[PDB]
Design a protein around this ligand. Structure first.
Ligand SMILES: Nc1ncnc2c1ncn2[C@@H]1O[C@H](COP(=O)(O)OC(=O)[C@@H](N)Cc2c[nH]c3ccccc23)[C@@H](O)[C@H]1O
Ligand SMILES: Nc1ncnc2c1ncn2[C@@H]1O[C@H](COP(=O)(O)OC(=O)[C@@H](N)Cc2c[nH]c3ccccc23)[C@@H](O)[C@H]1O
Ligand SMILES: [N+]
Ligand SMILES: [N+]
Lengths: 326, 326
């Protein structure tokens, strides 16, 4: 069967945008593919991290993955740093990528914007992501739209390596949701919902309580049409709300538009907030159980064992192809 | 006792400049320090390498290290790629180094000069070299003058890491020969003798036969003074020859100047060439023995075992300091 790989950075804020664009895909696809889901801690350190928060955020993210329903018997869940192959593969790929290719990455340009003094990990972020994916002979990489370009570069690297050293890598392909590929800020619906937004009202975290979710949904910027119709360009706010509602409820955009024919934003928002709470509650309760269990570490231990067996062998093949070592 | 670390890239050409600036130091210091001598294959791939040549060049360099007298009971000889910690440590250090710091490296500027399309490994060469050194709690790094700046950056990184995450690294210090720190081209004595010089008469390789050495020494560009006196600025050619003679013969520059008082360049060059042959012959014969022995691999195997035990533990400490993993 085919292989899937996907990663998420461990951080203080895991949003419903991460859930809808990614985690929901992981759970959907886990039984049909060989799955590798990673907590990308080495990618997290591309920007300064408080060490204590990082260690906690890594456990938090593992807990959320399992809380959302990632099943360790169906998928391999692990921490990037615990599989040395990623760093090994990243170095080899860094040697074949051009500086200009890295410089044109939008993620890099955005994260480095208006900085003095940019840390190099930010620039070399892609080769490490390419190594993440290529290590496992990945076919499909389920992500939100913001990762598309990185995966395009990964494809370029895989092809370059294969041309130079002999066919070794499978050329991976992004799988990006039709609806919910890019969940926007509740505060400014022309902007992507980001885990680093200085305004906490811009995102809903997976651990937000009911009152908080209600406040954030109610406050979500809309328009003065009082019409619940999807129109990304004309009604960015309501359209984004419709995407969240659709993806989380399972109802189609058309279904919701009819359901709310003649209705105002007030009833819509109240109903949406209930849909968000309904989604998050069971996740939160499963999350706290994981956070207090010794089983969390056992799952990660098993995930790292499997990941290492696979990635280490690919690293051997990579080295043999380039002539490194012996 | 203190610790020494030093590396050399495996390449088609290992020169008497590598011998005089480095290898001679390794042998001199091996009994008094804990020594780690590395074949930097991951650094070699910062420029394209034919895979077959690379694999051979790595064995060739191991053979030369042992041929020159590196003793496996006194030092640890190993291949960089066979110790995953180097790549792991390099990533962590890449996350703390600034792009501008890498961009100002002279080695990078020179190797990337007049290129289109520069491969990223060339730019990230330093963090990997810093990881090489810092992994082993290195005190002293014996090299020729051309590596001084890289070691300065390594010191900057070690201090930065220690300030941010707690004191972990020893701040390493270069040890650069007083005489022979920078052996120059025999063809243009204002240029460093380089393994990549398009003119084979510019360098003497450790495997050059007697006739070849004589031809290269005889042809070495001098001046029209017929005076054998050291004067780097005024007589770059003769001064460089004097440095080679001094370092290889054990005689001081003063000693040689007196020995050749009233003599012409012809007798000087003939005598120098004999000194080079006298040096290289036993090295070459030991080199061919190593190249045909199964013991070469056994030495590297043992070197990688020891290096891994040490570097892997430092990597654990590094991760704990940054909060990576668990
Ligand atoms: N507003 C949003 N709307 C929809 N989807 C969104 C939204 N915000 C985030 N996502 C998706 O969530 C996943 C994790 O996001 P990260 O920022 O940790 O995503 C990142 O920082 C990656 N560099 C981590 C990574 C490292 N290696 C990998 C290998 C394969 C795939 C991914 C990775 C991603 O799928 C992201 O697209
Ligand atoms: N003309 C010359 N005169 C005097 N000394 C010279 C001359 N040419 C070369 N050297 C010295 O030889 C050693 C190996 O050279 P490399 O180019 O492989 O040297 C290099 O390419 C390093 N980046 C390899 C390295 C990787 N990691 C390390 C950690 C510690 C020390 C060294 C390394 C060096 O000591 C170099 O200074
Ligand atoms: N599966
Ligand atoms: N020693």
């Amino acid at each position: 069967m085919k292989t899937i790989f996907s990663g998420i950075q461990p951080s203080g804020v895991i949003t419903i945008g991460n859930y809808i664009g990614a985690l929901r895909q992981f759970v959907e696809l886990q039984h049909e593919y060989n799955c590798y889901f990673c907590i990308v801690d080495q990618h997290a350190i591309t920007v300064w991290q408080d060490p204590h928060e990082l260690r906690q955020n890594i456990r938090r993210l593992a807990a959320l993955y399992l809380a959302v329903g990632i099943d360790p018997t169906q998928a391999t869940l692990f921490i990037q740093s615990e599989v040395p192959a990623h760093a090994q593969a990243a170095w080899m790929l860094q040697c074949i990528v051009y500086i200009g290719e890295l410089e044109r990455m939008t993620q890099f340009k955005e994260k480095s914007a208006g900085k003095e003094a940019v840390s190099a990990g930010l620039l070399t972020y892609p080769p490490l992501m390419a190594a993440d994916i290529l290590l496992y002979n990945t076919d499909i990489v389920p992500v939100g739209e913001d990762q598309k370009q990185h995966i395009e570069l990964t494809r370029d690297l895989a092809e370059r390596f294969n041309k130079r050293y002999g066919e070794l890598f499978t050329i991976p392909e992004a799988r990006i949701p039709k609806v919910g590929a890019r969940i926007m800020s509740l505060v400014d619906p022309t902007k992507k919902m980001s885990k680093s937004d200085p305004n906490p009202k811009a995102y809903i975290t997976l651990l937000d309580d009911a009152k908080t979710i209600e406040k954030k949904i109610k406050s979500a910027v809309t328009d003065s049409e009082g019409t619940i119709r999807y129109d990304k360009e004309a009604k960015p706010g309501i359209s984004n709300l419709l995407n969240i509602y659709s993806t989380l409820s399972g109802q189609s955009i058309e279904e919701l538009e009819r359901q709310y024919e003649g209705k105002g934003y007030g009833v819509f928002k109240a109903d949406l907030a209930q849909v968000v709470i309904e989604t998050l509650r069971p996740i939160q309760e499963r999350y706290h159980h994981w956070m207090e269990s010794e089983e969390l570490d056992r799952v990660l231990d098993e995930g790292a064992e499997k990941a290492n067996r696979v990635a280490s062998e690919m690293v051997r093949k990579m080295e043999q192809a380039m002539g490194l070592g012996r």
